[PDB]
Curated annotation (Swiss-Prot), chain A:
PROSITE patterns: RIBOSOMAL_S13_1, RIBOSOMAL_S13_2. This is Small ribosomal subunit protein uS13. The keyword Ubl conjugation applies. Component of the small ribosomal subunit. The ribosome is a large ribonucleoprotein complex responsible for the synthesis of proteins in the cell. The modification N6-acetyllysine is found at K92, K104. There is a cross-link at K89, K92, K104 (Glycyl lysine isopeptide (Lys-Gly) (interchain with G-Cter in SUMO2)). Keywords: Acetylation, Cytoplasm, Isopeptide bond, Ribonucleoprotein, Ribosomal protein, RNA-binding, rRNA-binding, Ubl conjugation. GO terms for molecular function: RNA binding; rRNA binding; structural constituent of ribosome. GO terms for biological process: cytoplasmic translation; translation. One of its GO terms (cellular component) is membrane. Component of the small ribosomal subunit. Its main location: cytoplasm.
Curated annotation (Swiss-Prot), chain C:
It comes from Homo sapiens (Human). This is Small ribosomal subunit protein uS14. Gene3D superfamilies: 30s Ribosomal Protein S14, Chain N. The gene is RPS29. It comes from the Eukaryota. PANTHER family: 40S RIBOSOMAL PROTEIN S29, SMALL RIBOSOMAL SUBUNIT PROTEIN US14.
Swiss-Prot record, chain D:
One of its GO terms (cellular component) is nucleoplasm. GO terms for molecular function: RNA binding; structural constituent of ribosome. GO terms for biological process: cellular response to leukemia inhibitory factor; cytoplasmic translation; maturation of SSU-rRNA from tricistronic rRNA transcript (SSU-rRNA, 5.8S rRNA, LSU-rRNA); ribosomal small subunit biogenesis; rRNA processing; translation. This is Small ribosomal subunit protein uS9. Its main location: cytoplasm. PROSITE patterns: RIBOSOMAL_S9. It is found in: Cytoplasm; Nucleus, Nucleolus. Signal peptide: none annotated. PANTHER family: RIBOSOMAL PROTEIN S16, RIBOSOMAL PROTEIN S9.
From Swiss-Prot, chain F:
The chain holds residues 17 to 117 of 119 of the full protein. One of its GO terms (molecular function) is MDM2/MDM4 family protein binding. This is Small ribosomal subunit protein uS10. The keyword Ribonucleoprotein applies. The modification Phosphoserine is found at S77. Belongs to the universal ribosomal protein uS10 family. It comes from Homo sapiens (Human). It is found in: Cytoplasm.
Length: 143, 72, 55, 138, 144, 101, 189
RNA sequence: ACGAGACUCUGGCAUGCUAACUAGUUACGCGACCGGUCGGCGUAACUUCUUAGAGGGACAAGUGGCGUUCAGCCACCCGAGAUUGAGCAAUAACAGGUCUGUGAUGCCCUUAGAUGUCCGGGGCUGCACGCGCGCUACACUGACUGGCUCAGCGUGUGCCUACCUACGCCGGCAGGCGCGGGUAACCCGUUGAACCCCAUUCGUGAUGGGGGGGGAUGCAAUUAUU
């Protein structure tokens, strides 16, 4: 017994018409700020019925999950547990996700590359900064 | 190299799972996903609902191996 | 002052100074059981202590 | 003083102390058919339908087990049970049907009376395991 | 024919102990179920939302089996191989703050009797109730 | 008190056997509630030593064994008798220690 | 007591081996129930003949690096689709098992002979032991390589490979590799 | 004659003998429903187990067969075992390694001008076939979460030694406040580590499958050693 109205082939939350074929709450892994533990805990604590079908999802579920990603404090996530915890420039604890400027907030590399620190002076030429021994190896993508 | 299945609601909602399957001698969720291009969630839900209806005989279960047949 | 003029540098992981004492070298030292002897003299004084080989 | 011939499979040793009883059997504070993997369930089932319940109705058997591995504990519990049954039922009552039951045992599986001799092999230096050597650089 | 804590298939024994105790409601529920990671070897959240009740059932069973099972022991029960990435995987225990919370749980519910020299023992009445749930699970399929 | 222990340790078997012969001779001198020797397991340590200082040739790890053997005896006896039995200019190579816990 | 597992009757079984049964003995007390008695027969010449086919096939399907040592899952995976062929055929699965096995052994093999001539080798008949062992190994290889990145699920595919080889149709991996090898050898005679 | 072998140890060998609750040892009204599971408790049981000193066993002697019917070889019946592994390992030599185990030894700066004494900065973590087992994992056999059930017989408190959390809690690790029971089979202990009846998910796809700031061992996290 399925819901016969409003049903869309595409599961739409963030206004980017990705393929809605994927089952519920598994398509939010592409957001640059919510992933791994955070995304999984906020779908598993959202009380979702993963045994439901694509044509039996309801507007209540999508509305509630939209509200839950809008509000970071739906279940009192700690600040050290928060995604943008004590980030540079400004300290914001609100769960906001929009294209155009979020990745620029993630781009705190401006300062590190400008002050030409040790990591910056490495990155001037494109040298590794995590100890990967690539003395002459590294043929993946370098022909 | 590419193969696509269907998770939409069509004749697969009722047909070939509510009245045509009992003609078989053995049912397997992989066989259902072969004959109808479905997923594991649908296979488990359909088996549970059909068993609640009462036309199916259990064999055993596993995380990826749950076996049933027909008896009516 | 005096603490920078001389000896402003310790070594608390020193193995070279606290090396195998009985001869004059650092290598060939394992810190179990208080060996303080190189493997060459380890064998030269093995059977004397009671060491035997069966494997 | 006592035989208590026990049972060993690999490093896992199980001993079955058998005395006068009702015929029920216990394995490590537990009856038999509740093994967690429950894939070798029939392996522990083997003796009871091999020799028959009419011989397992007058002897209380307690099994103690110790030794690593899931399967290694098995193949010794049943061996211990069988050999304890042979010992007890031989030392007291009769020898003809003793020959009968030991012959049935032998034709089904010789391991039920006599233990597996072969065990692990020590590792020698210069390689990962016992016989295997490291890769030669070239 | 009597009851035993392990005579039944222990799966349903422990499962029905946890279910019986959650429908009875005597045990309290913890305040945090996500802030802790429950294990060093685990890098993501559990998937029960009553795993505190599950762990309480597990530790009750394991204390029924062997007494003296003081803290520093149940931390190894859910611990296991830790994927250290490229490093070889060694045995690492679970986050013992959660085991400490379950230790807080047992204390004050009369579940365990402690002693100064280490260890803790189950109450005889507690094993009476454990034999009662054992009788329930036995009469479910084997004493029915 | 009647709680005195003696621990003897050596790497040789015949030495421990002659020490047990000393103890059984003392027990033959007078019958006392002295329990039998406690045979600790043959305690083995392995040591393994590369020989080629620089890498040149095979990986011949000299495998040497240090197998120490330990015997215990706990005695409830007058001190003088066992002291005379024991302090009899004991054999070299076997180490004996008397403990009162 | 005298039947397999207490369910598979061993009394009214089929002959089905004329004289290949000297290799495979599943028709007397020499037929143990479970396909697990530890690998203890691989210590002398021809003790493999004593070993039941089931245990040998269970041991074999545990290879390819991804199945190194883990055997209880192999026993589970064979008992599954053992039940499938059993209930699809309705009778004791022994006949269909043996049919699948004996339809897969390569009838002849092109062994390289000659001093330095690799352009013509000899097509010789294959021994029953080598035939059956290669058949089992190659069908298990086909089952595994039909399970990685493949829409089919392992522990069910081998049932269809078994029934197909028992019937003999060319869809199966084992009989098709055997037939291609046979045609290569026929070129070589 | 040396070497091979025998020889030594090692899993098979307490199916009988040397015998400690500190590791284990059926008997001993209680606890549990009223006769059957707790390893927390009691014949100080006169040690079968895993704790081991002696002694024993197997030898191609048994049978059949092959062999120029000798040395021997194969199969079979037996037996714990009808070839278990290592240990010791020629005469002579390589123009081998080690003075970087060493103040005896081929040596122009070795007239105490510095390689460390005293400093540790940049790196063998810098890039192109460029010689190096070191590459766990690499997905529906399995990755998740835990319902879950099993000896390392590796070993872990040191004359000028100082680096191995019970009882309660704040915590993602350590951090501790007295505090890791012990110089050890006493204290880590019946060292619940590993394929498993899955305890939500991932029914065929590169995807759920390896996967830039900080709170803190040492004098200084650095190309995230940790």
């Amino acid at each position: 017994l399925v819901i016969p109205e409003k049903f869309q082939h595409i599961l739409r939350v963030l206004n980017t018409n990705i393929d809605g074929r994927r089952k519920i709450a598994f398509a939010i892994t592409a957001i640059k700020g919510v992933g791994r533990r955070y995304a999984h805990v906020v779908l598993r604590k959202a009380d979702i019925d993963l045994t439901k079908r694509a044509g039996e999802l309801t507007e209540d579920e999508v509305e509630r999950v939209i509200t839950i990603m809008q509000n970071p404090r739906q279940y009192k996530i700690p600040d050290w547990f928060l995604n943008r915890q004590k980030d540079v420039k400004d300290g914001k604890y609100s769960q906001v996700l929009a294209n155009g400027l979020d990745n620029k907030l993630r781009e705190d590399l401006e300062r590190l590359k400008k002050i030409r620190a040790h990591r910056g002076l490495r990155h001037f030429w494109g040298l590794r900064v995590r100890g990967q021994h690539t003395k002459t190896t590294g043929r993946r993508g370098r022909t | 190299d590419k193969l696509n299945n269907l998770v939409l609601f069509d004749k697969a909602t009722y047909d070939k799972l509510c009245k045509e399957v009992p003609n078989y001698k053995l049912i397997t969720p992989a066989v259902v996903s072969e004959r109808l291009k479905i997923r594991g969630s649908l296979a488990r839900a359909a088996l549970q609902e059909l068993l609640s209806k009462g036309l199916i005989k259990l064999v055993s279960k596993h995380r990826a191996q749950v076996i049933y047949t027909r008896n009516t | 002052g005096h603490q920078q003029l001389y000896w402003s540098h310790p070594r608390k992981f020193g193995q070279g100074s606290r090396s195998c004492r009985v001869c004059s070298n650092r290598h060939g030292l394992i810190r179990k059981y208080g060996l303080n002897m190189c493997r060459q003299c380890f064998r030269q004084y093995a059977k004397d202590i009671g060491f035997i080989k069966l494997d | 003083q006592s035989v208590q011939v026990f049972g060993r499979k690999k490093t896992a040793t199980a001993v079955a102390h058998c005395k006068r009883g009702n015929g029920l059997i216990k394995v490590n504070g537990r009856p038999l058919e509740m093994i967690e993997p429950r894939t070798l369930q029939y392996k522990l089932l083997e003796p009871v339908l091999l020799l028959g319940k009419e011989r397992f109705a007058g002897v209380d058997i307690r099994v103690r087990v110790k030794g690593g591995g899931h399967v290694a504990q098995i193949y010794a519990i049943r061996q211990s049970i069988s050999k304890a049954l042979v010992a007890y039922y031989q030392k007291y009552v009769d020898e003809a049907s003793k020959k009968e039951i030991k012959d049935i045992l032998i034709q089904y599986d010789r391991t039920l009376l006599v233990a597996d001799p072969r065990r692990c092999e020590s590792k020698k230096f210069g390689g990962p395991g016992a016989r295997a050597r490291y890769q030669k650089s070239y | 024919p009597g009851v035993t804590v392990k005579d039944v298939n222990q799966q349903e024994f422990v499962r029905a102990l946890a279910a019986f105790l959650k429908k009875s409601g005597k045990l309290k529920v913890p305040e945090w179920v996500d802030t802790v990671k429950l294990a060093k070897h685990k890098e993501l959240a559990p998937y029960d939302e009553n795993w505190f009740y599950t762990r309480a059932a597990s530790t009750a069973r394991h204390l029924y089996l062997r007494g003296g099972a003081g803290v520093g022991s149940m931390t190894k029960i859910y611990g296991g191989r830790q994927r250290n990435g490229v490093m070889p995987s060694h045995f690492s225990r679970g986050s013992k703050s959660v085991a400490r919370r379950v230790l807080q749980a047992l204390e004050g519910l009369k579940m365990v009797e402690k002693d100064q020299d280490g260890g803790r023992k189950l109450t005889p009445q507690g094993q009476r109730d454990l034999d009662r749930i054992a009788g329930q699970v036995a009469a479910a399929n084997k004493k029915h | 008190i009647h709680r005195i222990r003696i621990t003897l340790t050596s790497r040789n078997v015949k030495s421990l056997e002659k020490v047990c012969a000393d103890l059984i001779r003392g027990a033959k001198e007078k019958n006392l509630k002295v329990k039998g020797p406690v045979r600790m397991p043959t305690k083995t340590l392995r040591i393994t030593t590369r020989k080629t200082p620089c890498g040149e040739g095979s990986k011949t790890w000299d495998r040497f064994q240090m197998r120490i053997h330990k015997r215990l005896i706990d005695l409830h006896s007058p001190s003088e008798i066992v002291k005379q039995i024991t302090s009899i200019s004991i054999e070299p190579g076997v180490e004996v220690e008397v403990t009162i816990a | 007591d005298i039947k397999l597992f207490g369910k598979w009757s061993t009394d009214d079984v089929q002959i089905n081996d004329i004289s290949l049964q000297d290799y495979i003995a599943v028709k007397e007390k020499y037929a143990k129930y479970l396909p697990h008695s530890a690998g203890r027969y691989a210590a002398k010449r021809f003790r493999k003949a004593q070993c039941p086919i089931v245990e040998r096939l269970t041991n074999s399907m545990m290879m390819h690096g991804r199945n190194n040592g883990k055997k209880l899952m192999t026993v589970r995976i064979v008992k599954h689709a053992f039940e499938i062929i059993h209930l699809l055929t309705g009778e004791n699965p022994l006949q269909v098992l043996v049919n699948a096995i004996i339809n897969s052994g390569p009838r002849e093999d092109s062994t390289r002979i000659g001093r330095a001539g690799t352009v013509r080798r000899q097509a010789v008949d294959v021994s029953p032991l080598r035939r059956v062992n290669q058949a089992i190994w190659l069908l298990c290889t086909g089952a595994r390589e039909a399970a990685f990145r493949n829409i089919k699920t392992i522990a069910e595919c081998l049932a269809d490979e078994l029934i197909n080889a028992a019937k003999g149709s060319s869809n199966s991996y084992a009989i098709k590799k055997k037939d291609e090898l046979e045609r290569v050898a026929k070129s070589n005679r």
